Structure formats: C-alpha cells, structure tokens
Amino acid sequence: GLSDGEWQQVLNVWGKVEADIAGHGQEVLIRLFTGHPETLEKFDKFKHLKTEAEMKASEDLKKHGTVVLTALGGILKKKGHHEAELKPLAQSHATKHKIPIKYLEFISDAIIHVLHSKHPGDFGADAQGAMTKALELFRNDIAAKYKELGFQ
C-alpha cells in the first residue's frame, strides 16, 4: 500500500485538480482520446468528435470530465479503503462499458501528463511517485474485480 506520507502527497496534488476540476477533466479526456483514438469508440456520446477543436468545444465532454475526476477524487480520499466506491465502478466498466484494463492504464498515464502540463515544475519527483502509486492501486483493485468477472 501507500504510506501515510505518500497519501498526504497524493491528496496535496489532488488540491490542484480540485481548484479546476472541469479543466483537468477535459485535458485528461482529450489526452486519452487524441493519444488513443480507439478509446473514443467506447463512448457513443463522443464518437461524433472528429477533431481536437471539436473535443475542446464540447461542453458535454467537460461535464463528463467532472464526473470522472469527482469519482476518482472520492476514491483517492478513502486512502485505499475504497471497496464500496471501487466495486460498482469496476463492475459497470467491465459489464456495461466494456473498458479493457489497458484503457485504465492509458488514463492513469494521461492524468500524470496533464498534471505536468498544467503545473510544470510544480509536480515534483515525490509527488509523481505518490500519485503513480495511488493510480496503480486503483487500477490493480479494478483488475482484481475484472478477473473475478473474467472480463478481457
């Protein structure tokens, strides 16, 4: 797991996200979609987005980004004690949305990139280590539920 020190770093970094949840959410999803266009195909509500301009101009994409990061922030504030929060997400993503664990890897990487991009020189080596661990824990606990369901 993460240490107390590490959790404190994670939630300190998260303060940056909470100051502009929509901006961060948008950039995360744009980073995902542009870097991995197959991921866009998982969203019937975003498949019409043919260009990054169109993505950037989509109010609904920003709305979804807020939903995404709000759910993730809920999970993070539980400091690993997130069974109740993570289980239904694991299950809707495997059973309904059909999201391979690789895509969760993609978005984890996207969050790290976006933090650097929006906060260059203000997301230190310790911060990245702690946030990376938190995102890995999240991914790994989802992966456990995916295996349970035989998904992917």
Annotated binding site: 64, 93
From 9-17, 51-59, 95-103, 126-134, span contacting ligand MNR (CB under 6 A)? 95-103
Pick 45 or 56: Cβ nearer ligand MNR: 45
Rounded-to-integer distance, Cα 14 and Cα 24, Å = 11
Quote the CA–CA distance of 9 and 78 in Å, as a whole number. 14
Instruction: Tell which one of 39, 62, 123, 134 touches ligand MNR (CB under 6 A).
Output: 39
Closest contact distance (angstroms) between CB of 119 and ligand MNR is 18
Shortest gap between Cβ of 140 and ligand MNR (angstroms)? Answer: 13
* Cα-to-chain-centroid distance, residue 123: 17
Annotated binding-site residues for nitrite read 64
Asked if 43 is part of the footprint of ligand MNR (rule: CB under 6 A), the reply reads yes
Of 18-26, 78-86, 102-110, 125-133, the segment contacting ligand MNR by CB under 6 A is 102-110
Shortest distance, position 49 Cβ to ligand MNR, whole Å:
13
> 62 to 81, contacts with ligand MNR by CB under 6 A?
67-68, 71-72
Residue 71: which residues within 8 A CB-CB, separation 6 or more? Answer: 85, 89
C-alpha torsion angle, residues 19, 23, 27, 30 (rounded to 10):
150
DSSP string spanning 87-135? HHHHHIIIIIS---HHHHHHHHHHHHHHHHHHSTTSS-HHHHHHHHHHH
User: Rg for the chain (alpha carbons), in Å?
Assistant: 15
Contacting positions for ligand MNR (CB under 6 A): 39, 42-43, 45, 67-68, 71-72, 89, 92, 97, 99, 103-104, 107
